[PDB]
């Protein structure tokens, strides 16, 4: 109980320091200087070199290390890209290294569907659009998005679960705070038809809480209870309907959530 008591005292001291007249004035003074500095360098940012230099340093792979892309900012980035961009014994063993494997068959199939497909190209699309879109819809109970993305089997599991929440008169309003480790874990063939699938894993920080529909009070979870969940998705691409605006052929066959633990 000492740790809980210390946390309240530490929060109270920080709150008192933040709410202190000197602290509030100091915080306001620091904020004002930062705003002026950004405005001062704003014309510098307008220079074509700054875009050239920033794209050199950042380039957008900083998203590998975390960060959640807001739904609105997620749509504009995809729309803008779509408008312009997206529009002896050793030798025998060494030979077996270069030989065709099951993962080689899976990636080759997806390359016929889309000549631009690659492990690094799809992982960027997963990291930037697909995973944030699905995870945000999953925690917020957005069945309209999941209907397009999920297959018949995982969606019927989701709709069955969301049905239970209806007779409890509760609705899900969760948040995704940060998505990490978005990667293609494995590429396997689904027996016995050898359906090529991509197993995708990710780790996301989230707040899972439910509110009563009629009033809005808390019914489950907590307003401030961050969890480090692990999500496992199995992806396949339909050779047909690859011209879909939203999913462009991708379809989730399995969606598993596990390994949730507290985080901060």
């Amino acid at each position, epitope marked *: 109980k000492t740790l809980k008591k210390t946390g309240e005292t530490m929060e109270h001291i920080a709150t008192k320091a933040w709410e202190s007249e000197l602290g509030k004035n100091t915080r306001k003074a620091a904020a004002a200087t930062a705003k002026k500095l950004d405005e001062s360098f704003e014309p510098v940012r307008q220079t074509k070199i700054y875009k050239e230099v920033s794209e050199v340093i950042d380039d957008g792979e900083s998203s590998r290390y975390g960060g959640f892309i807001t739904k609105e900012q997620r749509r504009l980035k995809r729309e803008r890209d779509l408008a312009s961009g997206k529009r002896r014994k050793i030798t025998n063993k060494v030979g077996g290294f270069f*030989a*065709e*494997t*099951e993962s080689s*068959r899976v990636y080759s*199939q997806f390359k*016929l569907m889309d000549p631009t497909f690659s492990n690094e190209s799809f992982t960027r699309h997963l990291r930037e659009y697909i995973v944030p879109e699905i995870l945000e819809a999953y925690v917020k109970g957005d069945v309209k998005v999941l209907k397009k993305w999920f*297959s*018949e*089997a995982p969606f019927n599991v989701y709709a069955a679960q969301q049905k239970i929440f209806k007779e409890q008169d509760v609705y899900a309003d969760g948040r995704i705070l940060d998505i990490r480790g978005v990667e293609i874990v494995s590429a396997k*063939l689904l*027996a*016995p*038809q*050898d*359906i*090529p699938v991509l197993v995708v894993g990710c780790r996301a920080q989230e707040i899972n809480l439910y509110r009563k529909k009629k009033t809005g009070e808390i019914a489950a979870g907590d307003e401030a209870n961050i969890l480090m969940s692990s999500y496992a998705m199995v992806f*396949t691409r*339909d*050779p*047909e309907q690859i011209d879909d605006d939203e999913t462009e052929g991708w*379809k989730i*066959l399995e969606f598993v959530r596990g390994g949730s633990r507290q985080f901060t």
Partner: antibody
Amino acid sequence: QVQLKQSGPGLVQPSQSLSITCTVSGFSLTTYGVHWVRQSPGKGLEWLGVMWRGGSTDFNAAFMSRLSITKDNSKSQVFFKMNSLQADDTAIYYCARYGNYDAMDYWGQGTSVTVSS
Amino acid sequence: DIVLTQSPASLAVSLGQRATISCRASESVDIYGISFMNWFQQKPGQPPKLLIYATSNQGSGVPARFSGSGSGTDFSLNIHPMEEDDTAMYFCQQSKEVPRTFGGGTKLEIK
């Protein structure tokens, strides 16, 4: 490239056994599987059994008591065998490698088998 | 199990026009929304040659004039424009469940 060779005997005596060896080349039996398909002129194409990519077999329910499909990874060979044959078992027997979406993409040259005396 | 009925049993069309072959399945052949219908072509003295797999995908090296369509239980193969070479026996084969079953075959000829 990928190429499947069959080595089986024609003119099988009635109530005897037919054995066909499908020697594959250009791919490994570990990563690909081989179907066994029959084409009678009075019954058309019909599927007998499959040597799955994983290494298990599955047979047609009408031939399950007679069929026997075994493979050998080292020699790249698939072995087919029917215990008893009659006049209606006269057809051309194909071994077909299957790929993604169970596409029988490569086929053997076929083994025309006649059951007579 | 899954009986594939193929129509018509025979067909004769002139060069340059479209030849349509239909396959109708007793059940549905869908797994995960993908229809596992394959189309084969067999010349008289040769093994069957795969044309279409997963109901719409050209086989390796298949000319673009072969097209697969359909979903549910109704499937079709279209040859257009037809050439002199592609006169053969055409089969539809499902791969949803064992046993794999083939269609009756459609003899497609020239006028």
